[PDB]
Amino acid sequence: EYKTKVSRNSNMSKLQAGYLFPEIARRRSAHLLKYPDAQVISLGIGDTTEPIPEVITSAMAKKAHELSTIEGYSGYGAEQGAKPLRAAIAKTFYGGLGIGDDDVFVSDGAKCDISRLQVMFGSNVTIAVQDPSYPAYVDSSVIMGQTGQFNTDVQKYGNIEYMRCTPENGFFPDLSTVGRTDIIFFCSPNNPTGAAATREQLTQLVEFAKKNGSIIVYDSAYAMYMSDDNPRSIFEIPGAEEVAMETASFSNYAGFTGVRLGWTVIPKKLLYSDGFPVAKDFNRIICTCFNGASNISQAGALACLTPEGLEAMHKVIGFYKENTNIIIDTFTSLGYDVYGGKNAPYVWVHFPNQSSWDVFAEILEKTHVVTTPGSGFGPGGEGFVRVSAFGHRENILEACRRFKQLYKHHH
Amino acid sequence: EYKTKVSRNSNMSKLQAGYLFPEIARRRSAHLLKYPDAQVISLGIGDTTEPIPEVITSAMAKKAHELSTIEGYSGYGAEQGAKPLRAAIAKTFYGGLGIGDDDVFVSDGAKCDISRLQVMFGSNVTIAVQDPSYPAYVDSSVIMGQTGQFNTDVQKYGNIEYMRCTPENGFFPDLSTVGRTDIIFFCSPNNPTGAAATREQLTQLVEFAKKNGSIIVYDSAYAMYMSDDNPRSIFEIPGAEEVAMETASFSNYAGFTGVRLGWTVIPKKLLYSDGFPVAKDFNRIICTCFNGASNISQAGALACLTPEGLEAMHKVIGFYKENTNIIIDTFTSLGYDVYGGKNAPYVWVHFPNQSSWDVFAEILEKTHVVTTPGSGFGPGGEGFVRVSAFGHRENILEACRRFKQLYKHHHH
Ligand SMILES: Cc1ncc(COP(=O)(O)O)c(C=O)c1O
Numbered sequence: 001e002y003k004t005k006v007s008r009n010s011n012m013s014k015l016q017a018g019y020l021f022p023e024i025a026r027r028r029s030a031h032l033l034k035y036p037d038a039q040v041i042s043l044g045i046g047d048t049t050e051p052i053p054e055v056i057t058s059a060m061a062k063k064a065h066e067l068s069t070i071e072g073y074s075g076y077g078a079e080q081g082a083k084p085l086r087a088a089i090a091k092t093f094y095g096g097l098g099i100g101d102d103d104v105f106v107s108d109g110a111k112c113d114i115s116r117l118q119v120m121f122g123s124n125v126t127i128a129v130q131d132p133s134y135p136a137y138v139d140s141s142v143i144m145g146q147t148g149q150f151n152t153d154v155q156k157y158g159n160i161e162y163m164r165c166t167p168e169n170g171f172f173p174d175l176s177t178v179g180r181t182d183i184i185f186f187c188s189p190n191n192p193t194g195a196a197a198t199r200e201q202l203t204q205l206v207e208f209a210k211k212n213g214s215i216i217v218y219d220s221a222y223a224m225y226m227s228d229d230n231p232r233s234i235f236e237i238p239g240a241e242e243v244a245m246e247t248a249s250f251s252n253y254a255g256f257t258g259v260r261l262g263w264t265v266i267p268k269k270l271l272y273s274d275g276f277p278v279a280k281d282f283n284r285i286i287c288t289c290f291n292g293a294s295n296i297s298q299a300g301a302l303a304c305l306t307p308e309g310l311e312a313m314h315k316v317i318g319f320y321k322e323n324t325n326i327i328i329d330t331f332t333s334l335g336y337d338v339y340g341g342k343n344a345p346y347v348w349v350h351f352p353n354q355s356s357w358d359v360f361a362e363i364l365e366k367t368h369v370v371t372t373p374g375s376g377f378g379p380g381g382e383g384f385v386r387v388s389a390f391g392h393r394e395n396i397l398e399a400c401r402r403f404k405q406l407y408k409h410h411h
Numbered sequence: 412e413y414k415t416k417v418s419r420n421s422n423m424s425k426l427q428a429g430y431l432f433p434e435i436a437r438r439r440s441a442h443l444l445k446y447p448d449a450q451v452i453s454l455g456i457g458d459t460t461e462p463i464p465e466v467i468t469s470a471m472a473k474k475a476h477e478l479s480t481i482e483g484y485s486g487y488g489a490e491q492g493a494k495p496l497r498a499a500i501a502k503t504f505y506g507g508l509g510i511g512d513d514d515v516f517v518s519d520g521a522k523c524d525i526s527r528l529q530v531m532f533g534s535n536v537t538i539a540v541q542d543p544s545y546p547a548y549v550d551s552s553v554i555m556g557q558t559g560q561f562n563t564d565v566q567k568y569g570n571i572e573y574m575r576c577t578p579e580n581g582f583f584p585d586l587s588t589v590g591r592t593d594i595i596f597f598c599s600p601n602n603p604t605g606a607a608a609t610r611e612q613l614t615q616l617v618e619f620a621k622k623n624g625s626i627i628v629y630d631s632a633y634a635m636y637m638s639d640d641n642p643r644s645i646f647e648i649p650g651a652e653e654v655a656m657e658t659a660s661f662s663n664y665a666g667f668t669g670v671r672l673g674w675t676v677i678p679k680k681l682l683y684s685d686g687f688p689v690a691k692d693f694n695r696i697i698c699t700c701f702n703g704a705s706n707i708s709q710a711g712a713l714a715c716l717t718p719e720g721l722e723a724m725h726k727v728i729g730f731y732k733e734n735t736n737i738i739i740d741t742f743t744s745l746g747y748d749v750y751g752g753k754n755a756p757y758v759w760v761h762f763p764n765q766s767s768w769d770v771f772a773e774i775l776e777k778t779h780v781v782t783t784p785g786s787g788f789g790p791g792g793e794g795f796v797r798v799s800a801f802g803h804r805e806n807i808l809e810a811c812r813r814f815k816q817l818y819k820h821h822h823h
């Protein structure tokens with residue numbers, strides 16, 4: 001066979017396996033070939049299942065129709081997003097926190113922003129992550145050349161600072177043990193533990209970044225699931241504006257997982273060591289590497305941030321929070337240590353003396369329920385399994401009855 | 412003021428100015444402050460102006476409504492795109508060229524794919540570009556670290572092979588003079604020159620890439636504007652499957668500039684030097700750095716690839732081709748050497764012995780028409796201005812009447 005003379009990107013070779021979620025999808029597909037009539041219930045990837053509220057879809061349908069008219073047609077939009085949407089985001093989520101419309105950048109989702117932020121930061125920064133955490137932070141770091149190879153003894157990539165988060169520390173790292181890095185990725189409520197940092201803990205985090213001259217990338221994608229009285233935005237901590245940016249999404253709030261609409265906020269006072277504003281470089285990246293979120297998706301997001309939109313999202317969130325309680329009760333009554341579920345739509349279940357890939361396979365084989373192995377979120381995830389609360393009520397109820405039946409005489 | 416201790420990305424520092432199109436927007440604004448009552452006509456950025464066909468927007472509205480129903484709701488899609496859409500793309504545009512559904516990757520636009528491909532290739536490859544060409548290829552290369560500093564003497568970033576395309580070489584590089592690189596970005600019909608490579612030229616291109624062991628990134632975003640009998644896909648050249656990929660969009664076909672939907676095709680036989688298939692690394696990128704094109708946008712694209720969708724896109728394209736003819740005739744009758752226009756919805760007008768930024772400024776100053784200076788597309792664009800044919804008919808006719816009044820004493 002012919003081969004080119006182009007060298008494969010050595011950062012791609014570093015990656016230890018495929019991305020977590022497609023690999024779960026692969027195993028689900030294999031299972032369905034093995035048992036074509038299996039009634040599979042999917043609680044692995046956190047994919048929303050309930051319809052998008054009509055007030056939101058009507059707005060998208062209306063925009064689509066307007067595109068067929070002379071007066072309603074629009075072409076390229078500003079890569080930063082429509083001004084009225086940036087304004088609605090700024091006031092709805094950051095009103096009174098000193099965030100301006102120009103600090104908000106509308107994206108086609110938070111996953112995409114994590115990678116565009118990483119292009120911006122470039123190959124020469126070092127990163128810290130919660131351990132466990134959402135796998136995109138680590139993988140985007142490897143892709144951009146910020147790391148060494150995967151070390152199989154400790155299950156870590158070289159040159160990444162993995163901050164230890166455990167049941168024992170309430171899933172917040174001991175910052176006195178964490179080494180200095182350029183960037184700190186911090187998710188609250190955290191995926192997969194469900195842990196939400198308190199005001200005191202976030203104050204420690206900002207003080208730590210300030211002393212270290214670090215940039216916090218704060219992921220608030222589950223913040224509207226907060227039940228405890230904790231801050232929902234990093235900008236609620238005075239001084240955050242000098243050290244932090246925030247990324248979020250409509251995915252988990254309006255069921256926009258397939259519609260594609262999120263945002264990032266980068267404050268005016270966030271500067272590199274030469275004084276250059278970080279926001280200006282992010283603007284260059286989005287003007288060069290992106291052409292804006294879909295106009296229809298933007299029209300949907302605008303409808304979300306109205307009294308009727310917020311009421312509709314609140315209801316959807318409430319439904320999923322009810323699902324979470326069902327799942328919590330099931331595993332608790334079976335005698336497992338169960339974490340999270342209070343401030344997030346998933347639960348983090350401890351399975352001692354088994355690898356989480358083995359647990360995943362066993363649950364899928366015996367109950368036809370898809371979960372997420374905890375090791376997929378980093379080495380501190382080993383021995384845990386994440387179970388999503390996103391599903392139709394009847395499916396959540398059925399998955400729990402399957403779990404109880406399997407584990408009742410054994411645990 | 413407080414500053415972090417994080418070093419600015421040295422590749423961002425390398426960039427010479429802002430992206431071209433935001434810079435034009437800046438000058439347009441400043442012009443409106445100077446002339447508050449001016450009736451500005453924009454023939455600058457290639458932004459579509461006519462409504463999307465109803466057959467297509469109806470499909471998008473229907474999908475939106477379906478998302479409000481139990482049965483019609485869908486969440487995350489395959490990051491690679493809906494299978495029926497990959498299948499429709501593969502058959503409509505590549506039927507008989509040996510492209511499978513699994514070789515097609517649906518995106519939210521060609522501009523985004525170019526930068527995702529650049530993340531995949533990484534910082535250690537070298538690139539070649541047409542000179543002139545669409546500025547994202549160069550700028551994405553600088554951002555990824557593939558270049559040296561900008562040299563102001565020659566107006567070029569170090570370590571990029573700029574392949575000069577001129578009236579004297581028929582707007583196709585003299586490949587015998589082009590140095591070896593890893594990647595060759597090649598756009599046909601070309602933006603900004605409008606030139607479409609012939610079957611013979613593309614054959615030379617594939618032969619060149621094969622001998623150099625290069626990967627061609629073929630940009631066909633204007634291929635449906637083809638009037639001459641020239642190939643529309645690189646995969647029409649036997650051997651292309653070993654050295655080429657293709658990136659395209661619905662932007663210029665259905666007015667999807669704001670809707671956001673494109674694709675990239677990477678064939679099975681395209682391998683890095685260690686035998687690893689390039690498509691597998693692109694798949695890792697789009698599964699890690701992207702979460703799929705919008706479901707609504709995909710439903711619109713699926714509706715494009717039907718008898719009714721194709722007829723409607725044909726009509727839209729035909730309207731812009733007629734605008735292009737109006738513009739060509741105007742500059743021709745004014746005594747200018749005018750290029751492109753035949754196979755693409757823009758015209759590449761020669762203004763020799765002037766700086767193109769100066770010509771840009773003069774046209775805007777006197778006629779209130781925005782164009783694009785050729786040097787925004789690289790040093791090989793110096794001496795030319797690109798004029799877009801995207802506009803309402805009355806706006807095209809009015810711009811042409813203003814050009815005629817501006818330039819009537821230049822030639823007899
Ligand atoms: C922790 C976390 N970060 C980022 C994302 C990416 O979200 P998006 O759907 O907007 O691309 C997700 C998925 O919802 C997530 O759970």
Ligand SMILES: Cc1ncc(COP(=O)(O)O)c(C=O)c1O
Binds near residue numbers: 291522598601662673
């Ligand atoms: C030559 C060329 N390539 C790529 C693009 C990007 O297209 P988009 O992101 O709208 O799909 C354009 C603009 O239409 C272009 O002119």
